[PDB]
């Protein structure tokens, strides 16, 4: 008999809590043969702001968290390789690449302090806005919410005023008019009532404008101090295949959410790959400043970008078992 607490920042019925974390938690419960019990706390019920979740898991406030790596900005700089503009065409391939790279580069450097169970990205990042956005010029003077320093850099370069705030705060911020719009993929839009609060959406054909990285993290001491066969049980239900499943389940949930916006009669602008090039011209210098930043930290930035593209093409869709 062991009770582990999982703390996370969205409601219990949202896509990732329901179809990724519960699934994962039940799999741990089963493979343990009812010897591990995992209690699930949503919407920061045990207290804190979403950015403190990692520290909650490192310090032992909670055993397990699902958080957004970028809410601790520049803390895990190697994850940023997947957050560069127009990097990612498939979330599964990204998550494959992310887990593989986590093991080689990150596990014992930047994530030494914590146990990582899962490394993934969401579906295509996009805009949701009070007024229409069909070309970059339309974002000039708009206050746009972003969730990470690289998204904020992206917003600056296309001419928006970036407002850093965690995702649950979006509804209140739109309602009060603190922001004119937000970045987020489709899937989380319905839990935040975004399609109710704004009437315009801007999506991209081709590689994603951006996506953000996530982890399922666990307290190290709480892991190590399990017995050897229960450690084996946690690891077995986590890691590479789990990371591929979370990314894919999260991206696949874009579809039903986009259709809820369509059903309302909201205006959705789809930017062709050809028309995306104007956006790329504005955002693509992030590649050079990011590599300069990494080099300033003694990190081979270009090697991470090359490696990440290498691994993603390499992804076969039958490394996807979970
Ligand atoms: O942009 C952010 O601040 C967070 C993004 C996010 C997107 C989908 C989720 O299910 C949770 C967080």
TrEMBL record:
Q: State the UniProt keywords alphabetically.
A: Periplasm, Signal
The record's annotation in Pfam families points to: DctP
Q: What is its main location?
A: periplasm
GO CC terms? periplasmic space
**What InterPro entries does UniProt report for this protein, alphabetically?**
DctP_fam, TRAP_DctP_sf
Report the domain of life of the source organism.
Answer: Bacteria
Q: Which GO terms describe its biological process?
A: transmembrane transport
- What Gene3D superfamilies does the annotation carry? Bacterial extracellular solute-binding protein, family 7 (3.40.190.170)
- Could you confirm whether the keyword Lyase appears in this record? no
Subcellular location(s) per record: Periplasm
- Name under which the protein is recorded: TRAP dicarboxylate transporter, DctP subunit
Q: Which organism is it from?
A: Sagittula stellata (strain ATCC 700073 / DSM 11524 / E-37)
């Amino acid at each position: 008999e062991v009770t582990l607490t999982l703390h996370q920042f969205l409601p219990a019925q949202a896509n990732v809590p329901k179809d990724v974390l519960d699934v994962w938690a039940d799999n741990v419960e089963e493979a343990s043969d009812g010897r591990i019990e995992i209690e699930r706390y949503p919407s920061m019920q045990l207290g804190g702001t979403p950015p403190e979740l990692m520290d909650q898991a490192i310090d032992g406030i909670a055993d397990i968290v699902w958080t957004v790596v970028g809410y601790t900005p520049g803390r895990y700089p190697s994850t940023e390789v997947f957050e560069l503009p127009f990097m990612v065409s498939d979330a599964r391939a990204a998550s494959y690449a992310y887990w593989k790279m986590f093991e080689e580069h990150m596990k014992d450097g930047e994530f030494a302090d914590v146990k990582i169970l899962g490394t993934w990205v969401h579906g295509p990042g996009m805009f949701h806005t009070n007024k229409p956005v069909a070309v970059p010029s339309d974002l000039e003077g708009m206050k746009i919410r972003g969730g990470s320093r690289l998204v904020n850099d992206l917003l600056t370069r296309v001419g928006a005023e970036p407002i850093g705030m965690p995702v649950p705060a979006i509804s209140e911020a739109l309602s009060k008019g603190v922001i004119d719009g937000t970045t987020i993929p489709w899937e989380v839009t319905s839990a935040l009532k975004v399609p109710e609060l704004v009437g315009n959406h801007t999506e991209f054909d081709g590689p994603a404008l951006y996506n953000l990285t996530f982890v399922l993290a666990m307290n190290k001491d709480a892991y190590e101090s399990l017995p050897e066969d229960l450690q084996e049980v946690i690891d077995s239900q986590s890691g590479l295949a789990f990371s591929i499943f979370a990314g894919g389940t999260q991206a696949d949930a874009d579809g039903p959410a986009r259709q809820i916006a369509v059903d309302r009669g909201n205006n959705i602008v789809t930017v062709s790959q050809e028309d995306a090039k104007a956006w790329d011209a504005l955002v693509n210098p992030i590649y050079e400043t990011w590599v300069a930043e990494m080099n300033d930290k003694g990190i081979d930035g270009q090697a991470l970008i090359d490696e990440a593209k290498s691994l993603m093409e390499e992804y076969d869709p039958s490394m996807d078992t979970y």
